[PDB]
Subunit: 230 residues, 3 copies
């Protein structure tokens, strides 16, 4: 929403990519462009690991609702495809990816969060696929992302019932991996990233793909199936 | 077992369907007929959500053991097929379904319980697929129902070892979603149902099916495979 | 490593098979041969259940690193194939199998552990697929074994991040089923085994296979795919 919604900072073995559009980090075309460019920077720098953060208010409130509800079909399709493409890129990323969930993560915000190898949040941040609560069916690509992380029963309630998770319930459900106090969420994320950069990169990259093979295939299908959804 | 084993009561936005055959709510042909008819009533009333309860003694002790062990093959086949058909109907039901687990849930009782979008029990109610303990192999349709809800490791022990779950262990395993005191299990179920009726029905119905697609397909196969089991 | 690395002791309804090569119970050809022979003994004795233990130092430190890194391709292939064959044999074993995790279980040690119907450890024993930390990609057969037991999110971190689990985190993740004090790990294992011997054997054997059908098929493929890995 702001003109310059993503910052990139390299600190030794890691790259820190921060979303702040001055509002709720809506994942519209400009934000997606800025995130892809930031990842290109990390590629160029051949960093050991990535940390992705939100701002002080949210991790992200999801796709841009203005575009989603504008009545223009192809722009909405393209926004959704771009968001799930970014999810694909992060889930298959050859370096460890750590998410600093610095506030609430709703819908595409929660799906983006769910692409990190490690995810840190504070206890009062809501994580929810709210689609059903607002009259939308969850796209197949999103379901596959959630199915990769959420326990079988948590997955059931997260989808059909739009259940909100947080703190201990998010940890148990598999929506996050670590709970920390708000003031140290980013620091904990950076610490984990520095540790994971110590793993063998080749083995990490190859193994993560094997552990996500079916999901990645289904996500590709889901991306090519977005049009059909509309 | 009693002549009139199911009651149907509409309360504002929900329908409450209660099993009480005066004994252990055996899921024989009469009980299955009564449950299907009660669901037909909820369809006619276009209710916002369903609550299904057991009695003061059990949720259900499962299929009628008398019929199961009578030596008459086709009646046993038909009873099993009907039970898993009912499971299918509830898992695909277009409105939120909340189970009030008012006592122990054994075998088909536990599988029926596992068809609710939300399931509430008290801490001392046993939930168990006891088939292996009594010399029976678990039908594929039942396995698919359990695999939809139980964590990977809980699923292993629930099946091959006939493990009994309750209270905190049932919650962790995914055999239930909420623990409440016995005297408020039904009230909590009704409260949740009223909340879920507030979700968008079209989106709930479409999303729940997507979140259960593979299970539903496998359950259909399992229903058509019952004969082969005998 | 020692000349006589496995002991077999029949106690009433169970057989106790103990690994102790005088070091870290490396799963090389001699150890695999001794374990298979011990299982043959249990077959001959038609025991009610199996307990498999490590020594005072570890459950097992995994495959023999000397052979793995010797530069001789076929011996390394054969060692890996034999280890996953043993895993297959135990996962499909017609009697209940209980693992007494008497110390750390690393890599193939953790995969072997994950083949038990019930697994008991003490709280400070590390359970880890350390492959990525040491520059190796996890074999598909190993991934399938882990995917059978670890929750969706634990599976992600166990593989790509070589996460170490122990105590409460191992229990939650699905790397173990029971935590006990070190001095009673074996006793608890034997107690559980005696209980499981009371289950109907025919039903246990048939049900466990159904609950593991996809994993077993994929493990067979993974065994035939070991060569390709090298
Ligand atoms: C289609 C898909 O399958 C999934 C896609 O992601 S669709 C996007 C779905 N996302 C949503 O519906 C978000 C619902 N909103 C929220 O959860 C909360 O607003 C929030 C947690 C994101 C922020 O909460 P908050 O800090 O307390 O601020 P709040 O009082 O709620 O209002 C947020 C402001 O940003 C706007 N906003 C919130 N989410 C937005 C989004 N995804 N796109 C565009 N604007 C958004 C609100 O309209 C409001 O704007 P104004 O105050 O200027 O009128
Ligand atoms: C074939 C499949 O794959 C799965 C199918 O579901 S097969 C059904 C498998 N179900 C069982 O084996 C049930 C085993 N029984 C139980 O778990 C317990 O009886 C219970 C939890 C259901 C009730 O426990 P309880 O309130 O303490 O009563 P309890 O003292 O155990 O006895 C229950 C009474 O109902 C009967 N009963 C229990 N389950 C029954 C069933 N599923 N069908 C017909 N009768 C049943 C018992 O025979 C006993 O009858 P009587 O006292 O008249 O002789
Ligand atoms: C290829 C695959 O996909 C998976 C296969 O399993 S490959 C095997 C991977 N396993 C490993 O890398 C094991 C790494 N080592 C460990 O985790 C720890 O050594 C352990 C937990 C096994 C034991 O810890 P410990 O009791 O504190 O003893 P520690 O001080 O670490 O040293 C262990 C001793 O046994 C040796 N050892 C440890 N694991 C071994 C293995 N898998 N094969 C052969 N030797 C091994 C060490 O070299 C050391 O030997 P020396 O003291 O004689 O030089």
């Amino acid at each position: 929403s702001m003109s310059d919604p993503v910052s990139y900072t390299r600190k030794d073995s890691i790259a820190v990519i921060s979303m702040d559009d001055g509002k709720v980090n809506a994942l519209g075309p400009a934000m997606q462009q800025a995130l892809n460019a930031a990842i290109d920077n990390a590629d160029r720098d051949d960093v050991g690991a990535l940390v992705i953060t939100g701002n002080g208010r949210v991790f992200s409130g999801g796709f841009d609702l203005k575009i989603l509800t504008s009545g223009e079909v192809q722009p909405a399709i393209d926004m959704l495809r771009g968001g799930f493409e970014l999810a694909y890129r992060l889930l298959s990323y050859p370096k460890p990816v750590v998410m600093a969930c610095t506030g609430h993560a709703i819908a595409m915000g929660a799906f983006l969060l769910s692409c990190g190898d490690h995810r840190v949040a504070a206890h009062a941040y809501n994580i929810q696929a709210n689609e059903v609560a607002i009259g939308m069916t969850i796209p197949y690509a999103a379901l596959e992302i959630m199915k990769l992380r959420l326990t079988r029963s948590a997955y059931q309630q997260a989808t059909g019932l739009a259940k909100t998770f947080f703190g201990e319930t998010a940890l148990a459900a598999g929506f996050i991996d670590e709970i920390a106090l708000p003031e140290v969420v980013v620091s904990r994320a950076e610490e984990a990233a520095r540790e994971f950069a110590g793993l063998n990169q080749h083995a990490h990259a190859a193994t993560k793909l094997r552990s996500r093979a079916d999901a990645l295939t289904a996500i590709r299908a889901g991306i090519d199936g977005i049009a059909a959804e509309f």
